[model samples]
Target chain A: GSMEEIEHRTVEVNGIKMHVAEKGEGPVVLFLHGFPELWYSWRHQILALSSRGYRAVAPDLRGYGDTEAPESISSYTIMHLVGDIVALIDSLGVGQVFLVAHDWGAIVGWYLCLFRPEKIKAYVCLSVPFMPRNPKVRPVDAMRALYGDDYYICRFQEPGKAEALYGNIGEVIKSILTNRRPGPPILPKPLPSWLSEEDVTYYASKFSKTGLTGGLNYYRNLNLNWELTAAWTGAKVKVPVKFITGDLDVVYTSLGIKDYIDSGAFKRDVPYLEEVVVQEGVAHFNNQEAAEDISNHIYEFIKKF
Target chain B: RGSMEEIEHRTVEVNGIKMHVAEKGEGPVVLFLHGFPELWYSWRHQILALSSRGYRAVAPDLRGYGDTEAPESISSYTIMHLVGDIVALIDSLGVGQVFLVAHDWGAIVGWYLCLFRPEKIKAYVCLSVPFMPRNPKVRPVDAMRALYGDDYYICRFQEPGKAEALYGSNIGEVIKSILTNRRPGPPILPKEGVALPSGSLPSRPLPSWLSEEDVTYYASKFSKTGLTGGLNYYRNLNLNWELTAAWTGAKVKVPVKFITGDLDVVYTSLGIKDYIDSGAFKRDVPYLEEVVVQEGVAHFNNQEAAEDISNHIYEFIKKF
Candidate 1:
């Protein structure tokens, strides 16, 4: 790609060297992406946030593409995840920044708001939710209760199951790139199709070097992550947090999910929660599926901060 | 106390038993009863069925009264209690007797046919849920899920704590008798009043039971009887279950008819469909019948459905 006002660079955060894509000049707007995506996922938001006079930064956190993965799974825990972001902010020499994140990135943003509440002026989450730690149940059991046997989270959590099912990273990348609905019976098959041929090739090339073991490791650390988020234990994110979701996303179909969403369980779990916008007719890839709307929603949310 | 029966008599076959006593000409069979504080005097239309040729009339004050009752508590109130009385009449005379009829205590008399003796029941005719069997599940999870839509109020009714709170004699009767009071603030609904459907209708001032003269006569007979004896009915759910579960594969084998006055809002919350299934008739009564709702009747359907009610019963009975 061609260089724009925003600059792309790599900096060491916490103990890990993190890859960050940055642009614009005034206030800082940090973008985070979730599972199966990297810093590049925020390409559209980079321009939108930059135009709003905010420095937009999206970083490939540890264990992701172009980012180094630590040997131990403990390094990927919430402490490390939040630590990397705080370190990235310090490396940028920015005292405070508005946070925008989607999927796993949102999870990181949630913990960041807690660990370094002073650094995040406002927070925005996309796709996934500010899931609170289960008070008395395991995440797998909670997923089972919410999504039953067919939910993706349960399938992903099964030991060695996702890799065994999707053989090499090519299959995982191919599936995610060409993902489509009404495709296959099992959740992992026929991944959403928003990713073009080029995107799939790029993801496959990156995955071939890293295999899925690194990504799958994230699933293994759920309990460990849950245990380490003691500061967020019995706590709700009190900073203003906004949410953007895609209506067609399969996560909404899970049972008891509406209870977690519409019922304000997240807000009850995090009192400072703000607006949640569900984009009509979009899939799990909200930014990819409807980038303009996603960008606009984030831009409007940040304007308030 | 005193005697009377400008009230009628005659029987018909129900299930395998021949029910004895009571009948006037018919449209449907509206069987009436005189339990507490009243007699067939309450079922004037039942007797008039003979004249109107509407209901096949059979109003017995029930055992220990106008002409029924075999005495022992077992005889007076078993699972087979009033059912036996009704069946005796059926066996002695007519074939497959008339549809049921009841009120206050009489309604309990009718419920037996719907719950156990369903093979003999044509249609269910009663006032309140005065006699539904406690639901099968200890927690009734399935039933609660279907009725409350994630809310479970009725399930709480079966809880031991709630049962105890509403168990006393006065509270129990208040639960039964305080049906509708439109006179003021939030209406004092019946179930909210006495709390127990188990105790002899909770203690509220009797509307028609009259003075010490009337009450003393009844209380004296009932005094020798501890409220607990009557309350054993409430306590016998498990016992009832032990006895009725044998009929698990069993269903009401008849067409059940129900009659509720539009004014009776209690039926709205009873969640009746939870219990009776379509098979109740396929297996029990092949000649299942119908339910007749009187327009303005409150819980007092017997009083309101009287004249037309008897005729409807008579007409229904004549068919089978």
Candidate 2:
């Protein structure tokens, strides 16, 4: 409802035309959304922070929303995402910015911070933490070794399998967005209160128009990113950082995730780590469920500089 | 003032003390800490500004101010005591970390907070005070005495009941004197003859940013609580120094951004400019993001430049 003033525009970045929802003016606060999401995922934040005087910008990343999704899965590597943001900043004529990201956006956020620390002033990530690249294992291989061939990431490896499974775009959106069970994927029933029928239809309509392959391609390139980011083997996210996730979020309960975050290893890897907040009784779609709190978190941490 | 209705006032128990907090919005917490002779109301402008943008803007009557319980002993107001109140405050609110905005004595508390409990602070915005790490070799009162003699306000504040006595019964006068005095230069010392104004400045009109109603509101609160609670923060300076011996040579590792009016006494202090400009300030606060100096402004820059200050705070903290 507060998005009445949000301005929509199409901009050329990284060899593709990207749709960006932007509002307010001053220092830039770039929002990056995750899988099955568009810049619209950050609608609440865009309105909240922009009203507070930040140029809150959320582009439909490289592959989702109205942005162009290249046919080549290889074009969706981590580098490509990072390149899109860098060129987006350049195109906007801003030198550097604050980054707020969720889901796959967080994955790209981590690499962007690692490879181009100078481009970001600080970073706030939701739902995902930066898991350092393993020198010994490719991502898909590691997923297969641990989760087997049927794991979502592994199943997503073959081009047409996920497409067939996700035949009805609206139903697929409803399934992914409303699911709340933590640990091990399970289809959700009795849709969560956070996502209304209207909301489902809105997202489903968008996905129907754009299709899910553009987003799935990101999973397809995980191993490619691992192969290409060899130079960042021991790199750390040097920028100031804050990470927030719901306790019940599947990613938070994933094997070794709690150990990694709680054992000080996360702080060791992210030496500039400021705070890690785990909200009780929350799930993976925390930003949407607790939109105001997430925006407040972004404004609170980033205002220090 | 209409937004005042949006701010919820309540008292909560933190660190075994009752702290009266004014809160607004329904989002992440941005805690505001007021300095000497001030209450949570000092952040009224900020509370409204930040809350409107969706932060759960919180400002508490620190251990010994406003409606919060004030302990009788000076020891209860030490850095450990003050930091404990805040840590417990966040814990009580079910928050893991808070964004801190502090001024004067509150800024001092914020610095020590970041040093002692960096994990509880998401990022820090310290106004009027820079992170002056604890001097391992000297007590703060003695150090102040050596530098500016007994006349120094901090040193003068050392003698319990003396400042309370000089700052007499007219609570309104005291509040008016402290809030309105804007002459900026060197530090104010007891013998400098630049004593606190006897009463409201009859000769000058109130600054547009501060209305008569605002002063009356502050006067009304201080009138009831008295000044001893706030002054005790100064009384514990030496004790805070003594207690922070373990933090010697420690850097404020949390991300920080410092702002001060060019004319602020702290900014103009004998060695402060040199320290800030000499790269030492950055060295001390390694994650020090930026230092903003608003030219032609004085110590009460928050009131003088409320919009800019709010925007500056928003600019930096939104990054994390």
Candidate 3:
């Protein structure tokens, strides 16, 4: 007979809502999802981790599916985004929780470790790496010094331009999902020798929702977000941080950021920076495409913490 | 039959290669053009001024003309463009003998008078303006600050994405020309009942060179003429700096001349202090001539200065 994994509906801490899928319910582990994706992105991991006796809860984050999307921009700030997870752990009645998050959710996970270090017993992030707060400067000055005018980010900020180009939302989603035909090439092209068509479809379907506006809103707020970090500007991360990035992920080339991640600048900012593991044959959608491998890495990291 | 008026011919100055220009004259006086919209229209005024004077004077509108074209970029708009005209003036004369009376373009003409003086001048008459001595200190001070950094400037120039969309040959040229208009209003707007010079006055008479025939005319003439020879004037900024950098100290030691109508549109628009600095001139001009501000007169001070103006030039030439 196969052991049973029960899906339970519960309102975790602060009257916030969450759904937990548990098999054995031992150590509480929380899973998070990236942009354009829902809690369903973590389904395989939830099952894989739950089967191993870890109580895994994956909630539909704010603004997508069942979770409430607050009208206020402030509610979507890093604090509110990560606050729900802390509230989830408190609702679970757990003293502390092991955290695993990927994509934009990983950014929230990072903030959780930095802002509410007490709630996180351990942290494991996937796909997305940590980016320190940018220095307050004019966008043009920074871009010109870094990438010159040819860079897209510089072009996007030229007011009234980028949104005009992304006119058709549905087409963008379909193309992002197909990952193969004529579209923005899926990052880390040639998509790791390990990935297959089924893997591509599986990741694409979760992002098929119209809720990508909120997720892209996160990217649009880079300057606004940097402004909000005034006091916390240049604040180092003092909590334990473990990063798991796919070797093929294009984010490693972010502004030639390899040096910061290798040296302790990234770590010093997060004094408790533990390790960064690069999976050999994975893409940016590592949480879905390499579910078993990513889950295994998360479990191993959590065990050490 | 008709006095020696109504004569016109365009020839390059053999020596200086200044675009030697002449239109109707038998006496001994010259005229020059000022800013924008090259010399063709100046022909309208020159025909009357030179012929009436009976002076064997010539009017060659400076570069970027039916004969010349300026460089297409901002960095290429420079003062050397003016020097090219002066060299042309010297070469135009067979022996060089005359008094100088310049209007708007001619005042800029008078400034060049410092470099190459006309022999046997009865007087130096400058209308609608005064001399603009090159100030060593007035370089691009706020350019970097205003632009944020060189990247913003680079982005504007770089033909990329939508920016490239903004610079098509015709419509794009219109936008560029509109943007280049002085940041203020043309010289005829009122501020709280008082009038102010806000926009360029000369824009009205100018024709849109967008039509195929027009652009063809401009490009064909200028293309063969080559913009490099003219634009080289502007591109020589670094060279201008290099030359002036060694000028431990030098000033425009020219004879005094000032001409303006109290209501001269440029005066009413930009006001007197806008172009010529009086204090700077007091220190520079060895013979500071008295300023004649004729009330109700306009920028065509030479036309306004006519009989009395001509008399003043004759007096100044003999006295100086």
On a 0 to 100 scale, what is the lDDT of residue B320 in model 3? 43
**CA shift of A118, model 1, Å:** 1.3
* Candidate 2, lDDT over the whole model: 0.81
Q: For all candidates, what are the clash counts?
A: 62, 12, 22
What local distance difference test score does each model get?
0.57, 0.81, 0.53
lDDT of 3 by residue, B87-131 (tens): 445434653444556665446535544433323233556666565
Residue-level lDDT of model 1, residues B164-246, one tens digit each, is: 34433243233234322212221221444444332443345544323334444344443343233333333333333433322
Complex DockQ, candidate 1: 0.01
Q: Residue by residue across A148-255, what tens digits does model 3's lDDT show? A: 654545554443454455554545544443342321222220444444555446445533443454555555555544433332334455567788876666565455
Worst 10 residues of 1 chain A by lDDT: A182-191
lDDT of 2 by residue, B1-320 (tens): 22887789999976667899999886888999988788888888889988877788999988788899988887677776787677667777788788999998889878877765566789999899898865645677787788877787777777777777777736775676677667776555547435555433363567778888888888888777778888888887775554443344557778998999998878887778898999989988999887999988878877778888888887877887
Q: lDDT of model 1 at residue B170?
A: 42
TM-score of chain A of 1: 0.87
Chain A TM-scores for all candidates read 0.87, 0.96, 0.77
